Design a protein around this ligand. Structure first.
Ligand SMILES: [Mg+2]
Ligand SMILES: [Mg+2]
Ligand SMILES: [Mg+2]
Ligand SMILES: [Mg+2]
Ligand SMILES: [Mg+2]
Ligand SMILES: [Mg+2]
Ligand SMILES: [Mg+2]
Ligand SMILES: [Mg+2]
Ligand SMILES: [Mg+2]
Ligand SMILES: [Mg+2]
Ligand SMILES: [Mg+2]
Ligand SMILES: [Mg+2]
Ligand SMILES: [Mg+2]
Ligand SMILES: [Mg+2]
Ligand SMILES: [Mg+2]
Ligand SMILES: [Mg+2]
Ligand SMILES: [Mg+2]
Ligand SMILES: [Mg+2]
Ligand SMILES: [Mg+2]
Ligand SMILES: [Mg+2]
Ligand SMILES: [Mg+2]
Ligand SMILES: [Mg+2]
Ligand SMILES: [Mg+2]
Ligand SMILES: [Mg+2]
Ligand SMILES: [Mg+2]
Ligand SMILES: [Mg+2]
Ligand SMILES: [Mg+2]
Ligand SMILES: [Mg+2]
Ligand SMILES: [Mg+2]
Ligand SMILES: [Mg+2]
Ligand SMILES: [Mg+2]
Ligand SMILES: [Mg+2]
Ligand SMILES: [Mg+2]
Ligand SMILES: [Mg+2]
Lengths: 92, 93
RNA sequence: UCCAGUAGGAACACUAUACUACUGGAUAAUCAAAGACAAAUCUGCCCGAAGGGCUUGAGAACAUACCCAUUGCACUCCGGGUAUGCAGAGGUGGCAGCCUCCGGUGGGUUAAAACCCAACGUUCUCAACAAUAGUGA
RNA sequence: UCCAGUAGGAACACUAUACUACUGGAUAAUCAAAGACAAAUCUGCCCGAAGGGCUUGAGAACAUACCCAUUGCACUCCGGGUAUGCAGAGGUGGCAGCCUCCGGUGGGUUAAAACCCAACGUUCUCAACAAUAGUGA
């Protein structure tokens, strides 16, 4: 079921953390407010990213019209996060 | 570059069999109009590429526009207009 | 191995020497390029018995490049591997800030420059070395 | 090396030798598994002087899988490597349909099946070989 935070993978792992951050925010901002967007290049967290919207509908609208988007020459795979983010759990 | 019945596509997943590529392409482009034929070769020079021929010029335009970048077989499509008319069309009108 | 130019020459300051680096040269060692400790000595909080490193090395981290793995649901940084790092500087120790210089970017301005604006720049731990001569207080 | 079972034994057809392959066995050579040329002798067009290959090997092409190349404007076809291919068959030459049989795959049906439907299946060139005997027509 829907969730403020969307989970993205299949991301071009060769992209620097900094760039990936701003690039993601750039293409998702048009969908609403973005509290934060977590990105790690660990062995376990690379090629992945968590985007946090302030509204649940924003995430839904983003998951739908952006699914498959050719991000850095790779089709995005957006899903809902299986659990709420800390920023949101400790907010409401 | 001006419109053309036939659209040129490249950056296609070269690992895909000729047969599959054929039907898969027709499957996603049919919604844009009639398709006379769709040429696909796996030569050294023609692989990763495909030519789709519509019966209407507008069909090709509508297809080039709303399909550009489409994640086909895990690869962004690169649709352009064919630089020259196809034989099927030249020998038709 | 020598010679010169330039920078440095490491716990106060200058000079000379040893010596290190860069550049070019062959006893006459060319001519030259090149280059940041210039100015000034800041505010706040904190620690110490005492605040001042243009040395080298060994670890560690970090950054950048490729290579091998990895399709991975997290919210504390954190797989492995080769190569690279030798530009940042002054303001007396640490953190924060502010000022100035240097640098290569990105803007603004110009005919073009200046001039301005902004962000950014390898750090920690350990170990060795920080010499000699002269002068200065 | 022998023995058996099975298939084959290559230019009409049986059969028996030689011989090839698969499977299992040791002179008594086990028991067994396994397996498609069964039915039928089709419709066009074209070629010939005469239409009938379950043989072997090599090469080439092609498919599949992997590896390096390649972002590439075509409309007969096509870069390299590397490993597999030993199942397709009958309907008298070539081509095109069609029919049936094998095979696996996909789909429908059924409680399961049987059985239906569908698309599929290694080709070409060269070289060698297509033997004895018997009975046939
Ligand atoms: Mg982050
Ligand atoms: Mg000097
Ligand atoms: Mg020294
Ligand atoms: Mg030299
Ligand atoms: Mg000085
Ligand atoms: Mg000074
Ligand atoms: Mg100093
Ligand atoms: Mg210093
Ligand atoms: Mg070091
Ligand atoms: Mg998954
Ligand atoms: Mg998990
Ligand atoms: Mg690493
Ligand atoms: Mg190193
Ligand atoms: Mg540096
Ligand atoms: Mg200091
Ligand atoms: Mg101070
Ligand atoms: Mg400071
Ligand atoms: Mg500057
Ligand atoms: Mg102007
Ligand atoms: Mg700075
Ligand atoms: Mg000294
Ligand atoms: Mg026999
Ligand atoms: Mg034989
Ligand atoms: Mg044997
Ligand atoms: Mg028969
Ligand atoms: Mg015969
Ligand atoms: Mg086969
Ligand atoms: Mg025949
Ligand atoms: Mg015939
Ligand atoms: Mg035939
Ligand atoms: Mg069948
Ligand atoms: Mg039938
Ligand atoms: Mg068949
Ligand atoms: Mg014979």
């Amino acid at each position: 079921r829907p969730n403020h935070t969307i989970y993205i993978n299949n991301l071009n792992e060769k992209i620097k953390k900094d760039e990936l951050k701003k690039s993601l925010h750039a293409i998702f901002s048009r969908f609403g407010q973005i509290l934060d967007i977590l990105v790690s290049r660990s062995l376990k967290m690379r090629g992945q990213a968590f985007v946090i919207f302030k509204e649940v509908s924003s995430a839904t609208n983003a998951l739908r019209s952006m699914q498959g988007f050719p991000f850095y020459d790779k089709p995005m795979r957006i899903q809902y996060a299986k659990t709420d983010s800390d920023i949101i759990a400790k907010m409401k």
